[PDB]
Design a binder for this molecule. Sequence first.
Ligand code: HEM
Ligand code: HEM
Lengths: 449, 453
Amino acid sequence: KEMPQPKTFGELKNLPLLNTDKPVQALMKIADELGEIFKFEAPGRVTRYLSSQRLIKEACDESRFDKNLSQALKFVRDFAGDGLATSWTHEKNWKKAHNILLPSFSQQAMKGYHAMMVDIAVQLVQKWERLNADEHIEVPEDMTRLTLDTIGLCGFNYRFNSFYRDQPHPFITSMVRALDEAMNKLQRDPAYDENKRQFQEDIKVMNDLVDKIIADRKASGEQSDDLLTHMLNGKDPETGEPLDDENIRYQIITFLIAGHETTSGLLSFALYFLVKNPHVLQKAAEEAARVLVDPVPSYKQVKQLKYVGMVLNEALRLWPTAPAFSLYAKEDTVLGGEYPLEKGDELMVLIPQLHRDKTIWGDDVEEFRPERFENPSAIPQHAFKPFGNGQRACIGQQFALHEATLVLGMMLKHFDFEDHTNYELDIKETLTLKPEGFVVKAKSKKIPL
Amino acid sequence: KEMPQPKTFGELKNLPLLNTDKPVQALMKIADELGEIFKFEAPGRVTRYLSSQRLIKEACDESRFDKNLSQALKFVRDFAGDGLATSWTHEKNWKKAHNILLPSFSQQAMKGYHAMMVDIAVQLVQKWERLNADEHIEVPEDMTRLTLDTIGLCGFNYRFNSFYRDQPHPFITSMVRALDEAMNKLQRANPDDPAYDENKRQFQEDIKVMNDLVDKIIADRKASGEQSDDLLTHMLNGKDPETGEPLDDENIRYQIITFLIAGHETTSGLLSFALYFLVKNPHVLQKAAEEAARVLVDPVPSYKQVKQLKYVGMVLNEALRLWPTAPAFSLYAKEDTVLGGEYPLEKGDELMVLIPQLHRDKTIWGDDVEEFRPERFENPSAIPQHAFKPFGNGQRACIGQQFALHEATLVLGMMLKHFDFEDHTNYELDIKETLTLKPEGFVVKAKSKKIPL
Ligand code: HEM
Ligand code: HEM
């Protein structure tokens, strides 16, 4: 009945607890101490962090709870606009873009994106093939190069050419700097005036380039296999309307934001867990060699990388790279028979804690065992939520998993990996999670492309 | 361009291929060999069987194709009349009954039918609670008892009382024998033979039995002025907004017979296939049983609680994917058209949509099409357009879909709440075929969880 709450700071309540550089991991430690639910109070804000499958399965009841914009999402909305990720379910542009974009994110739609994904994946393989001896790989850096270029090419036929660069494309510099400002706002004022002005400059950089590419595509009339063509030609079946040019811009910015570093973190965490578990790596490398019998992987071959898919799912279990989402109660309701909630009350789903619920996974929750996902019906309802819930779930799930399965499979086919530094896991936190400083050496198997 | 075709029998062309007791399953095997489309020729009949989402999505374009009466539907029309299921789209009584009946089949209308559905569902639960040890359940038999009584009660406030009987109500005996004669006619190479003269006389006798009882109940209700929460009251009081007309007494009779035909064994087969798949996949059963116990917290389920049985709904949809109990429907080309960029069709040319094959299209569902995984339906947004058609297409889709799904969700949830199930014979799936599909001889044991009603 009475809900636990972590330590307070007078008038600031729990807010100073977020003024730390690893807030998700700090919230996980609080969940370890306080349990499946604790109240988090701040000036003008009350929310509740859920950590158990028992309560989260009720929170995922769409008749009782809808997606809420967290403070992070509200700050991201300042440059993601009413794109899919930062719009409310009741906003006209959400259901519109949802209906329009759903067919182009289907498993069937990945057949059309596969050739472009392979283009970038080959560039990653060739970079590592061309490294000199005793040089090493900066894993999250290269994974981010790959995912950024993949979404640029599949999103609107634009080549960031990240593998030709030390300093990222100017759009990426502004996007990354905007996301950093969004998170820093969470942890904060006269001194922040230059940050605020800088925020507007980065917003202008993103809008200008995306608007230009849309105008360029409209001026050309060319049809590509990218999401931009689908949005310029698609019509919402419900209202009969197409997305306007401003919303198309926000959707493109959204795909870059929501997709690039979540997916690059997944690949980085997956490789980290593989090199720390050599038996799992060997099993995944065995499948990659048996399945990828051609110089270039096909769409059908990527679907055959079953164990690689389980590896990615287990990496998402331990460290989901979009580590939380927010919900609000549509009406007065009681959560788990003992926590009354009023209409509008907010919830936070702490995904990494959910995925460590020993009542679901057993005692070995910290062990990396892809075999947990061998049979998907053995997993209880709402126990595994790395991509959100319901109609507000990740629209790019199939995109992210297809790219990550293709790239990891190619990595495992072409290289053996060495954890040459005995890397100590250090998780840097932005709005997403990544293993900072993770490095490996790759010895080529000398298999041609 | 050139269309495949199965083996022929001289002058009879492909027709003898249907003279088998599992024709849908035989047509699926032909689809496995020949692909997404094959021509089927008979004396005086040519049709084409579609199996791929690629072609079926075009056949479902209502601007190009309209519902055709299959030969099965034409034979059912001899006792279903111009009811909704056996009338052409251009017949005045279709759009009339469609406009009148659509509001009474909506999800909002299920709130009014819920109490009557619970009545029969409790009778089923009570029957199984009262079984002795090591006695067993005949699953399709009991599911048919439930669906027949539910549509009887919700349709026109009549109790067949099937759970008080070994031999069904005389109306049910005549209806089943009429449906059996309809299917047997499909498989007769010499239908005008003198031997089937007793079949023809019996067929007319069964037609008379059905009309007499339904006409009597309509007259009985009109003479009393009683108002119930059934479809018969809605049809006696409803007026088509378009023409301003109500349904006449003859059409109301045909609609009532239609609800019984189109609804009873399609729905009972779904429940039977669902329970079969649950006992063969214990992980799915546990997941569905957990939801039933958590959601159905009252002795009697409410309408709102049934809507919360999401995973039970996923189980039913996956059961409908593998074995849709109304396994085909027919279409005709409104004008000359080209199907799939290679199959030129002329005005009036007929198509058959082989639904179980559509639901096994690996280009849509992946390689694991034969596996029972309700998780495919966890997010309904993952299913492409026209890939999943257990209830038909467009304005000629199943009007009773919400009814069927509410009934099935309620009953399966109550079954999972009150009993553990054992596949005590390791039942080997054997699908008996009439105009619908059912797992013949499927039996289970139920051990009660001792939860009162
Ligand atoms: C491993 C990689 C990814 C993970 C873990 C992930 C995670 C998530 C999560 C948890 C949500 C729900 C957020 C909420 O409820 O507030 C979400 C939504 C979303 N994601 Fe992803 N995502 C990934 C990749 C991608 C990619 C590649 C794209 C685009 C190509 C994308 C686009 C979106 C969009 C548009 C939404 C909002 C959908 C809607 O609300 O209608 N994500 N994602
Ligand atoms: C799981 C159960 C059911 C399934 C799979 C099913 C399937 C179908 C299919 C495939 C059609 C289209 C037939 C065609 O196009 O020729 C149809 C039509 C129809 N069904 Fe159902 N049905 C079910 C339950 C019911 C129930 C419970 C009722 C009545 C209460 C019902 C009444 C009708 C009617 C009236 C039509 C014709 C609608 C029209 O054409 O206007 N069905 N059904």
